[PDB]
mmCIF file of C-alpha atoms and ligand atoms in Angstrom:
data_model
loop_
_atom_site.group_PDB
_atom_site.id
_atom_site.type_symbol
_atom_site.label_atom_id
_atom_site.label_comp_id
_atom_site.label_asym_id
_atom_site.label_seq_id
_atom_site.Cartn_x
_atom_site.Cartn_y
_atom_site.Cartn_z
ATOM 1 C CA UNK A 1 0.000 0.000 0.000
ATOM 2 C CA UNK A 2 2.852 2.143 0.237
ATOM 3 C CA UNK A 3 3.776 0.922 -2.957
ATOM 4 C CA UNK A 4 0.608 2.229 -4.385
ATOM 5 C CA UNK A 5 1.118 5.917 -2.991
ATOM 6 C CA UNK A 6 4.830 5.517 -4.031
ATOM 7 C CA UNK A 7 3.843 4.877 -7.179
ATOM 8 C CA UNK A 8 0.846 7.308 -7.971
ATOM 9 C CA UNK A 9 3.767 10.261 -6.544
ATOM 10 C CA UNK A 10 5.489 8.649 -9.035
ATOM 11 C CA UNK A 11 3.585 8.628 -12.187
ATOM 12 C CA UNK A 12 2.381 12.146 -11.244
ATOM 13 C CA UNK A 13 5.466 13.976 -11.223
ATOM 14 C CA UNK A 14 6.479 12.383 -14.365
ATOM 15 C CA UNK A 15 2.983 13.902 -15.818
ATOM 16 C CA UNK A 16 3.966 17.289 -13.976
ATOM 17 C CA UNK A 17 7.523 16.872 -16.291
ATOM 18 C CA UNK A 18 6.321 16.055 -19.237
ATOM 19 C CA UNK A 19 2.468 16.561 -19.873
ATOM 20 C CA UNK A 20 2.395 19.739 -17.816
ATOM 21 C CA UNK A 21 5.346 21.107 -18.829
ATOM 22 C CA UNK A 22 4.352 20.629 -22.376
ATOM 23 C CA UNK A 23 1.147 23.021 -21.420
ATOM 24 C CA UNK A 24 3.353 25.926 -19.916
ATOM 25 C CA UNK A 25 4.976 25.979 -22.980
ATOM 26 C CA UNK A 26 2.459 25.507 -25.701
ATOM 27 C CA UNK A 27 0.147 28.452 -23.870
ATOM 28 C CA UNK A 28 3.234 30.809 -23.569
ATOM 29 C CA UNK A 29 3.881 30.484 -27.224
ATOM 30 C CA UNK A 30 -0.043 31.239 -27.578
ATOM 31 C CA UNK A 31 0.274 34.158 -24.479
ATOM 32 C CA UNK A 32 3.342 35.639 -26.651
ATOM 33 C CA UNK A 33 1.318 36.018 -30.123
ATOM 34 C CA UNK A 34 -2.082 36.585 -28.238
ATOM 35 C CA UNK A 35 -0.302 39.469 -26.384
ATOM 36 C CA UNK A 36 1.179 40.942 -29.499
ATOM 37 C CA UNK A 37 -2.127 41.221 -31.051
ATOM 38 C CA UNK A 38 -3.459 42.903 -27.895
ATOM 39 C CA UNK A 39 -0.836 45.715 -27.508
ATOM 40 C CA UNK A 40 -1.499 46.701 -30.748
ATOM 41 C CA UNK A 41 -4.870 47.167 -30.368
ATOM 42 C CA UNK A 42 -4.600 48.686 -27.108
ATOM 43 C CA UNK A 43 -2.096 51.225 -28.618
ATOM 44 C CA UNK A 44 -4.834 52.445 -31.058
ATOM 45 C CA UNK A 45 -6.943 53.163 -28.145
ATOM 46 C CA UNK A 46 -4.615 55.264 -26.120
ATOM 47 C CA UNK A 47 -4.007 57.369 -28.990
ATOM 48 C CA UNK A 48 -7.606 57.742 -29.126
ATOM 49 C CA UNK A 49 -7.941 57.882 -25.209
ATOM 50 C CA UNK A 50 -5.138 58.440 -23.520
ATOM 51 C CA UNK A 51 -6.654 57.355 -19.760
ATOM 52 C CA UNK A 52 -6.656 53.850 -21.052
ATOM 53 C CA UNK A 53 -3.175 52.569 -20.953
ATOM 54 C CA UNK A 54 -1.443 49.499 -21.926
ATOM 55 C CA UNK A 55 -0.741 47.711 -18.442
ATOM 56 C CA UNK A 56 0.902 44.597 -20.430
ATOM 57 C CA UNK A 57 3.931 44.440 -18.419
ATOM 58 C CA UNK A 58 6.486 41.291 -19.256
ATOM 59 C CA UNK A 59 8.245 41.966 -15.984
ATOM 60 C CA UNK A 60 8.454 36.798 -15.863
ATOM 61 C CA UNK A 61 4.953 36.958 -16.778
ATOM 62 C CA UNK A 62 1.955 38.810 -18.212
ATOM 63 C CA UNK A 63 0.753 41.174 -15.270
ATOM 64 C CA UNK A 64 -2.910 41.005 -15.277
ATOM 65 C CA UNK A 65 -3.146 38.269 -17.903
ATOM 66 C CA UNK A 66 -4.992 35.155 -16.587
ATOM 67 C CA UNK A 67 -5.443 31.669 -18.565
ATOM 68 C CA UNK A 68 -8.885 30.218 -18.645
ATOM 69 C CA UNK A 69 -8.079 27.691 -21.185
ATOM 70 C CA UNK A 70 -5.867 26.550 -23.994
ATOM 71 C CA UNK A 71 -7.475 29.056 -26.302
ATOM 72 C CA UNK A 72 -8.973 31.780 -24.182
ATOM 73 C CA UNK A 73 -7.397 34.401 -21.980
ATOM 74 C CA UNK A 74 -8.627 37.504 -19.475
ATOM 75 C CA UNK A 75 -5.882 40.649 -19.592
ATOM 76 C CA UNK A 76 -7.201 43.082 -16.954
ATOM 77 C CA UNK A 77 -6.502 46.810 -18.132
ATOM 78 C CA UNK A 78 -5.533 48.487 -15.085
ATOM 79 C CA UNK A 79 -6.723 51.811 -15.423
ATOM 80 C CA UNK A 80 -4.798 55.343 -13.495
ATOM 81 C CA UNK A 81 -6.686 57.079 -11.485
ATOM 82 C CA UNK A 82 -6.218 59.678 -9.155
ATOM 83 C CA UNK A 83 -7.958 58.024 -5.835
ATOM 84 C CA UNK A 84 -10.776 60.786 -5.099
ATOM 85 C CA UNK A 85 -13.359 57.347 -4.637
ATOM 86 C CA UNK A 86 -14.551 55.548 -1.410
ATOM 87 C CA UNK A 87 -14.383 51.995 -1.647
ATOM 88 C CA UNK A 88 -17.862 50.972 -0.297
ATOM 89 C CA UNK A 89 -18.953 47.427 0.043
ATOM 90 C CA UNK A 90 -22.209 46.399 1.351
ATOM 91 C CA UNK A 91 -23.770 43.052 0.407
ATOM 92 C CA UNK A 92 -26.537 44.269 -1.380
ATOM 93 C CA UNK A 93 -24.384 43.346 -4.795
ATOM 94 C CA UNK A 94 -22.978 40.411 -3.534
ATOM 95 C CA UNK A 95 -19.232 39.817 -5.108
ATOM 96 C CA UNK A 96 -19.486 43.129 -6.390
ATOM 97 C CA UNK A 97 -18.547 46.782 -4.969
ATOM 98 C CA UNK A 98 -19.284 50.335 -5.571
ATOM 99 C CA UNK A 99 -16.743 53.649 -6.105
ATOM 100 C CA UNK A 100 -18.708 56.662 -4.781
ATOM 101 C CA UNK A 101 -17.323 60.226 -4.856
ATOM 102 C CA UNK A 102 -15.358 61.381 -1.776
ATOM 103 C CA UNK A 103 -17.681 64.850 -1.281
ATOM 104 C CA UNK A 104 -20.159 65.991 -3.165
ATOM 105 C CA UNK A 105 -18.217 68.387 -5.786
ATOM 106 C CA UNK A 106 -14.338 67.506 -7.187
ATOM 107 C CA UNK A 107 -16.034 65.392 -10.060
ATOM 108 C CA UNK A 108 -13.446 67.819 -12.221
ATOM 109 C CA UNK A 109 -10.867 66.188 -10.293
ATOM 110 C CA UNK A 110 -11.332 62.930 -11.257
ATOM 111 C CA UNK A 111 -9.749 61.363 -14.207
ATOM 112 C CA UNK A 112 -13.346 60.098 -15.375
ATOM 113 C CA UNK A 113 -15.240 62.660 -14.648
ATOM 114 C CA UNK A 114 -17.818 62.239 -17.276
ATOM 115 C CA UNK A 115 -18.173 58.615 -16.006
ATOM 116 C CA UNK A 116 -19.103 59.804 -12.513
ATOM 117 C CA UNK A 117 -23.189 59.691 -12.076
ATOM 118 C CA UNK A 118 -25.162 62.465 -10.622
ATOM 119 C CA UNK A 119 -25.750 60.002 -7.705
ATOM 120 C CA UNK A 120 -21.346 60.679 -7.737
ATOM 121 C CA UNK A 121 -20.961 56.813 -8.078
ATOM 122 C CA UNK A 122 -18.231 55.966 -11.255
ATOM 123 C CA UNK A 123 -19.788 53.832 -12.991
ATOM 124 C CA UNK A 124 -18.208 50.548 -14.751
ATOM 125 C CA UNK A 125 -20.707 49.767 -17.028
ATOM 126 C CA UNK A 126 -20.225 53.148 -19.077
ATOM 127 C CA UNK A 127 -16.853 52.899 -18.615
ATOM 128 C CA UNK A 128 -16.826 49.376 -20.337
ATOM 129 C CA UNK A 129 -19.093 50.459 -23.114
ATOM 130 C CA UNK A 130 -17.236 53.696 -23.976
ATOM 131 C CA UNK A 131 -13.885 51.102 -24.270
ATOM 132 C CA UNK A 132 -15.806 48.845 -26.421
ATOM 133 C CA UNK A 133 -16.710 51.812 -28.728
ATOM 134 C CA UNK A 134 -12.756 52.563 -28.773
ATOM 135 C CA UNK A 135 -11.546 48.947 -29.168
ATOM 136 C CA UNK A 136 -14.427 48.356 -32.376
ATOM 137 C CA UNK A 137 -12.469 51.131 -33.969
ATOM 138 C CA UNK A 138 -8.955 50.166 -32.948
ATOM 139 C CA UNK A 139 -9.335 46.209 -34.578
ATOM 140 C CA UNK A 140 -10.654 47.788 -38.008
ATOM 141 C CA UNK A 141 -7.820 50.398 -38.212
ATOM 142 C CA UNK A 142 -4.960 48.405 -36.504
ATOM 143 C CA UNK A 143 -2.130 46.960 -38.571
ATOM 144 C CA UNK A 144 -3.777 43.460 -37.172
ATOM 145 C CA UNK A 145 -7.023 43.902 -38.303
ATOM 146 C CA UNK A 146 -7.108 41.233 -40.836
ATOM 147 C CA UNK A 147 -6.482 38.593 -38.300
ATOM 148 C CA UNK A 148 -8.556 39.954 -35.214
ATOM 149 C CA UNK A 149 -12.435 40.867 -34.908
ATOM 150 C CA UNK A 150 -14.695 41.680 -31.793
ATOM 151 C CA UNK A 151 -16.749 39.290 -30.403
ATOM 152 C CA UNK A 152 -20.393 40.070 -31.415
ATOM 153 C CA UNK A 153 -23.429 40.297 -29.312
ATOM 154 C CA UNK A 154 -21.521 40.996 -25.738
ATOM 155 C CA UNK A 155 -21.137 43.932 -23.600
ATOM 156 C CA UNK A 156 -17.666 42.832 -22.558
ATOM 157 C CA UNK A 157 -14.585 43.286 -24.574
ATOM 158 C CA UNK A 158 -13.405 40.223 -26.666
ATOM 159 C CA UNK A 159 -11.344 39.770 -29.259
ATOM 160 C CA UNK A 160 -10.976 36.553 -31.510
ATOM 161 C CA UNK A 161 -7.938 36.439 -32.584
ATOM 162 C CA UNK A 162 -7.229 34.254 -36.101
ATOM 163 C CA UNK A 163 -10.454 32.422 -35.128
ATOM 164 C CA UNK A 164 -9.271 30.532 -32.566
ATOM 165 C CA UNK A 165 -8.257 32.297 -29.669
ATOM 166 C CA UNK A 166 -10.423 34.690 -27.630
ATOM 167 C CA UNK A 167 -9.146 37.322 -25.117
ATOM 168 C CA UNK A 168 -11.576 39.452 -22.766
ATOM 169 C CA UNK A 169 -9.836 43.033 -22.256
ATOM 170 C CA UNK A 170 -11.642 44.157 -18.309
ATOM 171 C CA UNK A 171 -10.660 47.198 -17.400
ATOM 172 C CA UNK A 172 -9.749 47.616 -13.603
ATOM 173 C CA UNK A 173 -8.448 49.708 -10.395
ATOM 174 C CA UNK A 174 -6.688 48.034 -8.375
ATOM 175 C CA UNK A 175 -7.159 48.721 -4.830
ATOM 176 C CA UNK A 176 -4.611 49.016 -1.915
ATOM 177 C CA UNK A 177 -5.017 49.920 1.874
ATOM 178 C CA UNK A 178 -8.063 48.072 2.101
ATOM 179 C CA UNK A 179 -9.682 44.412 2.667
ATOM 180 C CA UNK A 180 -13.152 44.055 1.436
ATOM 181 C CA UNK A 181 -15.661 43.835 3.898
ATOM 182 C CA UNK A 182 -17.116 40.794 1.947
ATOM 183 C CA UNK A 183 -13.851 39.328 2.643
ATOM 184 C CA UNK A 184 -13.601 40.300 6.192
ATOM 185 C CA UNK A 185 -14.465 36.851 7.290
ATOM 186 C CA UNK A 186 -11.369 35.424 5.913
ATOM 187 C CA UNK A 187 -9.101 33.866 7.707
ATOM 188 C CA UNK A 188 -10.975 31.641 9.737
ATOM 189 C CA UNK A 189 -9.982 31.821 13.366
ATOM 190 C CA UNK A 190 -10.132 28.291 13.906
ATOM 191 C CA UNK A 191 -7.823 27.336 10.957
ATOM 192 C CA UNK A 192 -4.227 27.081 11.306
ATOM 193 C CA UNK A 193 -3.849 27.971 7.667
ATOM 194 C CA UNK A 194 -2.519 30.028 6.240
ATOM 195 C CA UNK A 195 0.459 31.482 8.869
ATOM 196 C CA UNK A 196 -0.768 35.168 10.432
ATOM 197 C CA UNK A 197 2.681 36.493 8.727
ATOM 198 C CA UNK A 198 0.821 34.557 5.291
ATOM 199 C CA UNK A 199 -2.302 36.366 6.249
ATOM 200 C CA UNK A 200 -0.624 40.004 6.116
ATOM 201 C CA UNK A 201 0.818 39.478 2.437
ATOM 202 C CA UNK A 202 -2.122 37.921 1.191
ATOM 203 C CA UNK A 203 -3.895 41.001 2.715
ATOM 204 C CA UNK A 204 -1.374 43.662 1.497
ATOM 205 C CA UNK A 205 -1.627 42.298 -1.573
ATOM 206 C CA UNK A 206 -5.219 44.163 -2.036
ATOM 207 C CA UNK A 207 -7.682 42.499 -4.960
ATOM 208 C CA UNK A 208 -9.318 44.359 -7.801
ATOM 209 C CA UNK A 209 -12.258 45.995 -8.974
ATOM 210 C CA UNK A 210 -13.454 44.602 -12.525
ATOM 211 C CA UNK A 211 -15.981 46.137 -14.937
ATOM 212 C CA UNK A 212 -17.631 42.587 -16.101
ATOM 213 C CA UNK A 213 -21.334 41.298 -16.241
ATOM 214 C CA UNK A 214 -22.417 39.329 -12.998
ATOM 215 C CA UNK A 215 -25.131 37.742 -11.022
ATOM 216 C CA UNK A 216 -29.378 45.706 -13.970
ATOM 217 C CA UNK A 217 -26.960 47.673 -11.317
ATOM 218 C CA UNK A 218 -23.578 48.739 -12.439
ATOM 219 C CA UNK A 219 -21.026 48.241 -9.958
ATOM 220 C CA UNK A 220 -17.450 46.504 -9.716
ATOM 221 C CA UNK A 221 -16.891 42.726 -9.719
ATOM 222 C CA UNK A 222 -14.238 42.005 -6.790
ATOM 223 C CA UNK A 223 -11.614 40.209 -7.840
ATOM 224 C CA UNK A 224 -8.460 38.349 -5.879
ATOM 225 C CA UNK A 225 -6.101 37.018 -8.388
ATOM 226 C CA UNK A 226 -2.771 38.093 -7.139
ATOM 227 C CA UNK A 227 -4.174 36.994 -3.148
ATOM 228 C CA UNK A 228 -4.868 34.131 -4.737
ATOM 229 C CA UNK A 229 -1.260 32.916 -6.108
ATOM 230 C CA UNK A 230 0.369 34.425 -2.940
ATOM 231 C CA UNK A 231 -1.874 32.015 -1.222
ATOM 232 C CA UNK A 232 -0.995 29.102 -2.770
ATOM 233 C CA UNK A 233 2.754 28.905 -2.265
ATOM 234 C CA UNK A 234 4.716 26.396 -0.558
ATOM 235 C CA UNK A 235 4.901 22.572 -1.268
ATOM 236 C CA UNK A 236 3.174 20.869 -3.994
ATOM 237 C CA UNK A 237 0.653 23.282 -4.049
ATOM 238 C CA UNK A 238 1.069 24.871 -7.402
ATOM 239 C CA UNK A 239 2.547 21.465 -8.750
ATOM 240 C CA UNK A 240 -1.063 20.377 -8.133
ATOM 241 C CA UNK A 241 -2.522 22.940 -9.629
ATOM 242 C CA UNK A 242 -0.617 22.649 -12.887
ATOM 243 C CA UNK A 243 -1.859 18.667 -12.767
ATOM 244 C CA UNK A 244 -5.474 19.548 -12.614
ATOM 245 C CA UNK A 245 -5.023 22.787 -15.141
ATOM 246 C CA UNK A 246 -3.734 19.875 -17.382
ATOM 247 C CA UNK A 247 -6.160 17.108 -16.832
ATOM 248 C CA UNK A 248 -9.077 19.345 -17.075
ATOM 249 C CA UNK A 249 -7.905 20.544 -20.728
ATOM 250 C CA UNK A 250 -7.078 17.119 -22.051
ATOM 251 C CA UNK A 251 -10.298 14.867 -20.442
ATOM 252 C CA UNK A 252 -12.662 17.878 -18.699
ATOM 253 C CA UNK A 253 -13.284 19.942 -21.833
ATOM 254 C CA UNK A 254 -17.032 19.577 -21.803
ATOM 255 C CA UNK A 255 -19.854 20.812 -23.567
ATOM 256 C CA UNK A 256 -21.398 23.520 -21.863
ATOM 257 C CA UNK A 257 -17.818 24.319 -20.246
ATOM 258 C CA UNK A 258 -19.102 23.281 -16.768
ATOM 259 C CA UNK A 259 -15.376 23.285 -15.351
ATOM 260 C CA UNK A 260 -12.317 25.900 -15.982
ATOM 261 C CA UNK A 261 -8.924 26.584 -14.711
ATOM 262 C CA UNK A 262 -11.081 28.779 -11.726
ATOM 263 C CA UNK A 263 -12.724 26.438 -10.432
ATOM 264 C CA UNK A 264 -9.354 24.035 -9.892
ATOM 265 C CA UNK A 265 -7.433 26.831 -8.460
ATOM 266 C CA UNK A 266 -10.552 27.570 -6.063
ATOM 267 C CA UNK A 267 -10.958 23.744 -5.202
ATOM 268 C CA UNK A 268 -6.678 23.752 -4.360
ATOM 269 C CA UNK A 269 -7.609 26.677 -1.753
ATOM 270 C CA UNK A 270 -10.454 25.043 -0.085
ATOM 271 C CA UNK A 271 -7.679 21.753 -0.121
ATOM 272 C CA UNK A 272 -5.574 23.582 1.939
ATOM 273 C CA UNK A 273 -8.023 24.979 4.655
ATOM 274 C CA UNK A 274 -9.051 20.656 4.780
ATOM 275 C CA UNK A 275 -4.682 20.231 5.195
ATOM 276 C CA UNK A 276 -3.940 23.221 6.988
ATOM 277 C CA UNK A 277 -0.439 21.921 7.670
ATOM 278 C CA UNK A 278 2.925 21.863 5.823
ATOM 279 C CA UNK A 279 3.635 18.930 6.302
ATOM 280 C CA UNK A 280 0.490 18.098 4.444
ATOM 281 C CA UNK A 281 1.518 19.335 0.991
ATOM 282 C CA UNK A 282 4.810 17.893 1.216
ATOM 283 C CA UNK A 283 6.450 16.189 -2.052
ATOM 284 C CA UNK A 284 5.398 12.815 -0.954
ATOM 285 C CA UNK A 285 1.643 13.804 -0.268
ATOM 286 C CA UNK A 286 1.072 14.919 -3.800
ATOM 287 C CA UNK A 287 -0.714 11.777 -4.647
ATOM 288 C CA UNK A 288 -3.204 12.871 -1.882
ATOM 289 C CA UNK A 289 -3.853 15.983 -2.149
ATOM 290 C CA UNK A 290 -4.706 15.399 -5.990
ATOM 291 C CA UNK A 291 -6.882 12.748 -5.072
ATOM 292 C CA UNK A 292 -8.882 14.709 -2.271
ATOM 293 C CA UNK A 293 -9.087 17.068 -4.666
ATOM 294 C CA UNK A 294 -10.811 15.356 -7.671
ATOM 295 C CA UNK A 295 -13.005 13.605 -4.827
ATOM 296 C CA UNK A 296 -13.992 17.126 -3.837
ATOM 297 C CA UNK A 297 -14.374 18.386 -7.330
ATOM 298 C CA UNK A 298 -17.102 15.545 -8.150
ATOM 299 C CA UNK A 299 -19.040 16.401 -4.913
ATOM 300 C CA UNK A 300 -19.491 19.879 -5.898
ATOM 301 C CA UNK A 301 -20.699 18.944 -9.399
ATOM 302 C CA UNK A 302 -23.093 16.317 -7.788
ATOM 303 C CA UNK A 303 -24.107 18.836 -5.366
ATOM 304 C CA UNK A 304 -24.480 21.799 -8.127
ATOM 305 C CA UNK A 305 -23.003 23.819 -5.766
ATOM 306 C CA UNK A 306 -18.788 25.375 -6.069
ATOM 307 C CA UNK A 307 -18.144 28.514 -3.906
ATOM 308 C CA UNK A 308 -16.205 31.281 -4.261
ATOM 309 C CA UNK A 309 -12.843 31.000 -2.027
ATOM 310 C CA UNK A 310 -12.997 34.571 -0.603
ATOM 311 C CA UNK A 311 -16.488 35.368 -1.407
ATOM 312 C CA UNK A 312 -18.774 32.242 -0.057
ATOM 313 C CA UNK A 313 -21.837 33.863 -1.022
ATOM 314 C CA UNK A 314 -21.097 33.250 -4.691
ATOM 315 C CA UNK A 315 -21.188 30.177 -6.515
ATOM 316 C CA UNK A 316 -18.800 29.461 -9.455
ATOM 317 C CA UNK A 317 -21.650 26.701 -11.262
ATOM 318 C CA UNK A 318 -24.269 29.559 -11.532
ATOM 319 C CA UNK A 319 -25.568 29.510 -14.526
ATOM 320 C CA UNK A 320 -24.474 26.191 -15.496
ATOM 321 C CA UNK A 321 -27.028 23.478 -16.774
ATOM 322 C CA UNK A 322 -27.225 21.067 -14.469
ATOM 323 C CA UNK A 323 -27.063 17.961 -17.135
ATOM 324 C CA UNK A 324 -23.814 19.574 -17.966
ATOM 325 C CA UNK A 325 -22.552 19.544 -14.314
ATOM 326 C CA UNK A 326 -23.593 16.215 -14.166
ATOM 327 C CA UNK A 327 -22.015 14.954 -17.237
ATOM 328 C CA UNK A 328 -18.643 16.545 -15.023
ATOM 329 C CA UNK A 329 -19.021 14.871 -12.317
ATOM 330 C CA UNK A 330 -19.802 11.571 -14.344
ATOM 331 C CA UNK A 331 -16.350 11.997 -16.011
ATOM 332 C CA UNK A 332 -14.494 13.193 -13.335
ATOM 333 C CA UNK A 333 -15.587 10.186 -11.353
ATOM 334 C CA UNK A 334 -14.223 8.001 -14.074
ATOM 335 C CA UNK A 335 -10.717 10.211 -14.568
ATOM 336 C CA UNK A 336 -10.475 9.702 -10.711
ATOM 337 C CA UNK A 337 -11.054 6.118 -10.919
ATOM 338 C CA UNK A 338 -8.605 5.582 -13.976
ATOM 339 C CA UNK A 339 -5.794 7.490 -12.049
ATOM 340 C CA UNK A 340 -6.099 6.175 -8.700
ATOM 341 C CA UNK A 341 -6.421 2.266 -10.044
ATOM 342 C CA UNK A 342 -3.658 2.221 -12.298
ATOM 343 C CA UNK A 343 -1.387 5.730 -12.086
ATOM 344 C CA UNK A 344 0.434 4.218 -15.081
ATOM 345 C CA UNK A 345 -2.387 5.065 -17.119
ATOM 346 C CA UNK A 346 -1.339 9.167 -16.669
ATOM 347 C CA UNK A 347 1.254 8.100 -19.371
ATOM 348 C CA UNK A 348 -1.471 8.068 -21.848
ATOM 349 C CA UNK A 349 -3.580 10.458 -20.162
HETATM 350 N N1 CTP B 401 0.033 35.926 -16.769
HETATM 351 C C1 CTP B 401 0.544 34.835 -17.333
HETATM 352 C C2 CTP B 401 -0.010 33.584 -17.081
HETATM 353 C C3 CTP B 401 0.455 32.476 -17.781
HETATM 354 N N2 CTP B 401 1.582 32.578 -18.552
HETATM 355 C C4 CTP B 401 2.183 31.360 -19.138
HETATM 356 O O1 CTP B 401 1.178 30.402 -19.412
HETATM 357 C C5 CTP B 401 1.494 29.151 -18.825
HETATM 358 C C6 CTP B 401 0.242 28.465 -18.303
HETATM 359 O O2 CTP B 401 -0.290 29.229 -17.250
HETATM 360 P P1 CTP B 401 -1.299 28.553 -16.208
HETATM 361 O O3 CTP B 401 -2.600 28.280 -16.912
HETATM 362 O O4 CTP B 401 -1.514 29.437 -15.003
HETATM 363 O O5 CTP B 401 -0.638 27.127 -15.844
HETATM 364 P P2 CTP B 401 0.358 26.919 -14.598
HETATM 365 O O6 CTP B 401 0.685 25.456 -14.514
HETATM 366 O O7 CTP B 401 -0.254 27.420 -13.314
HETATM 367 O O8 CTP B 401 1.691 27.749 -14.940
HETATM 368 P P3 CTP B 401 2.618 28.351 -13.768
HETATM 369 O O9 CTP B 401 2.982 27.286 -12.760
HETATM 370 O O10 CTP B 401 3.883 28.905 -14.372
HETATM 371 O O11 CTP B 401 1.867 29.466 -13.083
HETATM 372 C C7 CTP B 401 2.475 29.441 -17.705
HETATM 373 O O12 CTP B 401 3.420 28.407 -17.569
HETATM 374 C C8 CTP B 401 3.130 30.742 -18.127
HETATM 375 O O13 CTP B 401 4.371 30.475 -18.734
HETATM 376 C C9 CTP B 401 2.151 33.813 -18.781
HETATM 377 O O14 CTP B 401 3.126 33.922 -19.525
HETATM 378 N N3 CTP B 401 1.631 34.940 -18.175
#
């Protein structure tokens, strides 16, 4: 029986090396042309506008660039600002947050002042739409333009690039000096996990304030990406993560796209809060972690039900047909099976 565990560590890390390796580079040579596409038409809209800048920083990675699949990409446009808003957060949009003017005149003193209601909230749904307007114009005029359109039929901002790959362009604040009070729960007191000095990164990291579609009321989506990867450091953790990232493309590609990279990297959180300990995402416990993982994927498929890490009240299967959740879970199950009976069977997975 220690055989077995020995040997499912075993046949996982040599999927990590090869299979998942494969996938960090294949998507990096799609980030690189993807990206190239995107500054260009992004370029075309600051001439047009100069408030909305490029933020596609190489720094070694895309900053603001997220992966949802093979083929289909978020970059989140943060957007300057001068800082004359309140953050205020009340749950009556839950997972989503308003910017309201700090006293009632200084709307000249924001950047976006004709974006500012009468109410003095700013407002991301006519922020969005006035980008869309600018990007429309930028992929007919830029030098691009024969190989990139706008997705049709969609207040957010896509572009299909060659007709194959699709990147949403969200612009953003990102906001500093402040937790969310629909976050406020977080950490648990119980939990050991993560480490109070953790805690205070994750924290100082801040989150950000998206203009997407959710749930009419225009506010911000909250958003915790880069708490998110802080969060997941140390051990196997990410090494996980990349394995399910992987299997999901190759075997949980589904119609009706029940499952993405989100909901893995939300199920490896709610892992570690069940192992709060070090010790428990060590090298050698790889094989289970992955395996309480997929276990825990399939009951929140059966149960329809996949929360939000930070933000409980949301649920990331809303909206999703529950024959295609099912359909998940059924092949999940059997993925799960496959591994854990024979891990040899990864070779060809
Ligand atoms: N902002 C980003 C995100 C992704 N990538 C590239 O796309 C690959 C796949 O990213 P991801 O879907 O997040 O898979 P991971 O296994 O998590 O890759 P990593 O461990 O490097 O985060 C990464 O290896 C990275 O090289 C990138 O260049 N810039």
């Amino acid at each position: 029986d220690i055989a077995a565990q020995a040997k499912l560590v075993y046949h996982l890390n040599k999927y990590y090396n090869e299979k998942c390796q494969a996938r960090k580079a294949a998507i990096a040579k799609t980030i690189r042309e993807v990206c190239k596409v995107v500054s260009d038409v992004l370029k075309e809209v600051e001439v047009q506008e100069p408030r909305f800048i490029s933020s596609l920083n190489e720094m070694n990675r895309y900053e603001g660039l997220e992966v949802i699949s093979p083929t289909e990409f978020e970059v989140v446009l943060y957007l300057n600002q001068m800082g004359v808003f309140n953050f205020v957060d009340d749950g009556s949009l839950p997972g989503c947050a308003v910017l309201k003017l700090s006293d009632g005149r200084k709307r000249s003193m924001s950047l976006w002042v004709e974006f500012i209601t009468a109410s003095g909230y700013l407002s991301a749904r006519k922020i969005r739409s006035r980008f869309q307007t600018l990007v429309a114009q930028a992929v007919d005029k830029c030098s691009y333009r024969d190989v990139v359109k706008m997705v049709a039929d969609t207040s957010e901002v896509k572009l299909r690039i060659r007709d194959r790959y699709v990147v949403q362009i969200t612009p953003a604040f990102k906001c500093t000096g402040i937790w969310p009070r629909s976050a406020a729960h977080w950490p648990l007191p119980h939990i050991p996990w993560p480490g109070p000095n953790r805690v205070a990164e994750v924290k100082a990291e801040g989150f950000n304030l998206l203009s997407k579609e959710c749930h009419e009321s225009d506010a911000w989506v909250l958003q915790f990406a880069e708490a998110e990867n802080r969060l997941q450091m140390g051990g196997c953790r990410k090494k996980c993560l990349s394995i399910l990232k992987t299997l999901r493309d190759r075997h949980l590609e589904l119609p009706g796209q029940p499952l993405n990279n989100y909901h893995m990297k939300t199920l490896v959180s709610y892992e570690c809060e069940k192992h709060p300990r070090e010790s428990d995402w060590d090298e050698s416990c790889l094989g289970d972690r992955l395996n309480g993982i997929l276990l825990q994927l399939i009951s929140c498929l059966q149960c329809r039900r996949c929360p939000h890490y930070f933000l409980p009240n949301l649920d990331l299967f809303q909206g999703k047909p529950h024959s295609a959740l099912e359909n998940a879970a059924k092949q999940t199950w059997r993925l799960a099976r496959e591994i854990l009976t024979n891990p040899k069977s990864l070779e060809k997975l």
